[PDB]
Amino acid sequence: MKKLQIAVGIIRNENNEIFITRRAADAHMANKLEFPGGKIEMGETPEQAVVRELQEEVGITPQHFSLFEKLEYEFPDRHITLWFWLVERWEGEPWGKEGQPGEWMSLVGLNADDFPPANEPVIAKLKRL
Ligand SMILES: Nc1nc2c([nH]c(=O)n2[C@H]2C[C@H](O)[C@@H](COP(=O)(O)OP(=O)(O)OP(=O)(O)O)O2)c(=O)[nH]1
Ligand SMILES: OC[C@H]1O[C@@](CO)(O[C@H]2O[C@H](CO)[C@@H](O)[C@H](O)[C@H]2O)[C@@H](O)[C@@H]1O
Ligand SMILES: [Mn+2]
Ligand SMILES: [Mn+2]
Ligand SMILES: [Mn+2]
Structure with missing residues (x-):
């Protein structure tokens, strides 16, 4: 069974909305809503990975961010x-840089059922902020 380290960014604006993309129909966790992110590569750190992944996927550079949660999921x-x-400051304006759907979603309106099940405790903890 494959083992992966994944870094994702919870991109939160001043109006308590999160920038959320939707995964492709042929991807693992197909059609699910997601925080932008991806695989941590050999020779890069988790912090470097989330910067690179957000630059690739949505065209922003996160800065002064913090680890909101780290978890394992089988x-x-x-x-x-x-x-x-948790990314509350960034350079750029997030968009569907890889052609994927992306939009701002109110934190209170997030439905964990729309995301991979690994995200369930994170979505709950976000709504507690
Ligand atoms: N990006 C992202 N992945 C998540 C989330 N929750 C969750 O369980 N996952 C899982 C789905 C995948 O198994 C893995 C994410 O890998 P990925 O498909 O984004 O990796 P990647 O962007 O580097 O892959 P690629 O560009 O090479 O296609 O983690 C999430 O909120 N965001
Ligand atoms: O691990 C994040 C954690 O570290 C602090 C400093 O105590 O922030 C540092 O790390 C972030 C991730 O690389 C940087 O974005 C930040 O600029 C750096 O100071 C905390 O702010 C954060 O909780
Ligand atoms: Mn990616
Ligand atoms: Mn990648
Ligand atoms: Mn990805």
């Missing part, structure tokens, strides 16, 4: 460690 065919970074 999917049916892979084990993933997820690093959830």
Whole structure:
């Protein structure tokens, strides 16, 4: 069974909205809502990975961010460690830089059922802020 380290960014604006993308229909966790992010590569740190992934996926450079949650999740065919970074300052304006759907979503309106099940405790903890 594959093992991966994944870094994702919770991109939160001043109006308590989060920038959320939707995964492709042929991806793992297909059609799910997601925090932008991706695999931490050999030779880069979790902090470097979340910067690079947000630059690639949505065209922003996160800065002065914090680790909101780190957790492990066993999917049916892979084990993933997820690093959830809270990103409240960034350079740029997030968009669907890889052609993927992305939009701002109110924190209070997030439905954990729309995301991979690994995100459940994070979405709950976010709504507690
Ligand atoms: N990006 C992201 N992935 C998540 C979240 N929750 C969650 O369980 N995952 C899982 C889905 C995938 O198994 C893995 C994310 O990998 P990915 O498909 O984003 O990796 P990547 O962007 O580097 O892949 P690629 O560009 O090479 O296609 O972690 C989330 O909120 N955001
Ligand atoms: O690990 C994040 C944690 O570290 C602090 C400093 O105590 O921030 C540092 O790390 C961030 C991630 O690289 C940087 O964005 C930040 O500029 C740096 O000071 C805390 O702010 C944060 O909780
Ligand atoms: Mn990616
Ligand atoms: Mn990647
Ligand atoms: Mn990704």
